[PDB]
Amino acid sequence: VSKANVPKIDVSPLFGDDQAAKMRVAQQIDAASRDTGFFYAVNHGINVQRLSQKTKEFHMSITPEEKWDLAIRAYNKEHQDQVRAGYYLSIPGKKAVESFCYLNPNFTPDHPRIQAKTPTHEVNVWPDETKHPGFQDFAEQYYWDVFGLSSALLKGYALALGKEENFFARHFKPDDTLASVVLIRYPYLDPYPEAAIKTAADGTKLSFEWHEDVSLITVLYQSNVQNLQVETAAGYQDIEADDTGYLINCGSYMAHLTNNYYKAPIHRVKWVNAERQSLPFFVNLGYDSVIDPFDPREPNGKSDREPLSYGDYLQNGLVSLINKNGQT
Ligand SMILES: CC(C)[C@@H](NC(=O)[C@H](CS)NC(=O)CCC[C@H](N)C(=O)O)C(=O)O
Numbered sequence: 001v002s003k004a005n006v007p008k009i010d011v012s013p014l015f016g017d018d019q020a021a022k023m024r025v026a027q028q029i030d031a032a033s034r035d036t037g038f039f040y041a042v043n044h045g046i047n048v049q050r051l052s053q054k055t056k057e058f059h060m061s062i063t064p065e066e067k068w069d070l071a072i073r074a075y076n077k078e079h080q081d082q083v084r085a086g087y088y089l090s091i092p093g094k095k096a097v098e099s100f101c102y103l104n105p106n107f108t109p110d111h112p113r114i115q116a117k118t119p120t121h122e123v124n125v126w127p128d129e130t131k132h133p134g135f136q137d138f139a140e141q142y143y144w145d146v147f148g149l150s151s152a153l154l155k156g157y158a159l160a161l162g163k164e165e166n167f168f169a170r171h172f173k174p175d176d177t178l179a180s181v182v183l184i185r186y187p188y189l190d191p192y193p194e195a196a197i198k199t200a201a202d203g204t205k206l207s208f209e210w211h212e213d214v215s216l217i218t219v220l221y222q223s224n225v226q227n228l229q230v231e232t233a234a235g236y237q238d239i240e241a242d243d244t245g246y247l248i249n250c251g252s253y254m255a256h257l258t259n260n261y262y263k264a265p266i267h268r269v270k271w272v273n274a275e276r277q278s279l280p281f282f283v284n285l286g287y288d289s290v291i292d293p294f295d296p297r298e299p300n301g302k303s304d305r306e307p308l309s310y311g312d313y314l315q316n317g318l319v320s321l322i323n324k325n326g327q328t
Contacts, residue, residue: 009042015045022155030161033160033262034262048221054134068089074327075087084101088101096207101182105140154168155168168291171286176286196271210266211268215284218250225274229267236268250265258296259293
């Protein structure tokens with residue numbers, strides 16, 4: 001099995017005012033986006049050591065009682081309004097992975113989208129402060145940190161495509177973004193449940209099958225355990241781990257709006273029996289956000305693709321991924 005070319009891109013110029021330097025960053029984003037579709041963002045400014053430490057303390061201290069109280073409706077029939085946000089339970093002997101998902105901290109009972117009961121919008125559920133002191137404050141602060149990184153990356157993608165730097169970012173707003181953080185625990189287990197291992201067509205043991213991401217872009221932290229593979233025409237290639245950087249790739253909404261000029265890379269998660277963390281931030285826009293598709297390969301940029309509302313995209317995409325690859 002070969003190794004994918006995943007460049008490390010210093011994204012620090014995207015936080016600054018040196019326009020030529022931002023253009024050199026954009027060129028590197030463009031080149032990675034048209035090759036394997038992945039790159040590591042380095043010099044990103046986020047304290048990933050603290051992220052990893054506070055996530056670990058959470059995963060290792062939460063109890064079965066608390067997991068039921070936080071569970072999404074797939075695991076608790078009482079929580080009919082928790083489709084996205086809350087706890088995704090493991091099943092001993094059957095399902096190894098478990099995770100906690102939270103959304104925009106600004107979705108409160110008073111928020112107009114929550115009052116209108118708009119699909120894909122939910123109010124976050126949190127554990128008890130006295131049992132997990134500081135966890136919610138940390139988690140909400142992390143949301144806005146990674147929001148800020150993601151904003152800057154979106155300026156890079158816009159410049160890469162020949163657009164003004166706010167082309168995407170203007171639709172990525174603290175008041176209405178559907179972006180989510182997921183804090184995923186992949187446990188070490190001995191014996192490891194066979195039901196939690198999937199076998200690929202090519203014989204590879206997997207934790208999660210091939211997919212395109214449901215996102216504009218995906219901004220991922222992982223601990224230093226190799227697990228991801230990306231599909232190329234010549235087969236799947238291993239993505240090397242780097243627990244100092246954020247791994248970035250496009251989701252299928254970027255592919256839609258660029259007429260597949262920036263493909264959403266197909267990737268999958270290999271089975272590794274190792275205790276690790278996978279902490280994606282899915283960059284979603286607002287429910288009513290629509291970006292007119294264009295084709296950068298054409299002088300005039302004309303595209304025949306229909307504009308697609310981000311809310312409709314996301315609603316269908318999340319369900320399709322569950323149907324295709326299973327409830328996580
Ligand atoms: C590879 C990582 C991104 C991670 N995979 C994942 O998180 C997988 C594939 S991209 N993603 C999902 O299941 C979508 C979760 C969406 C979330 N519930 C929400 O409501 O917004 C993993 O480690 O399995």
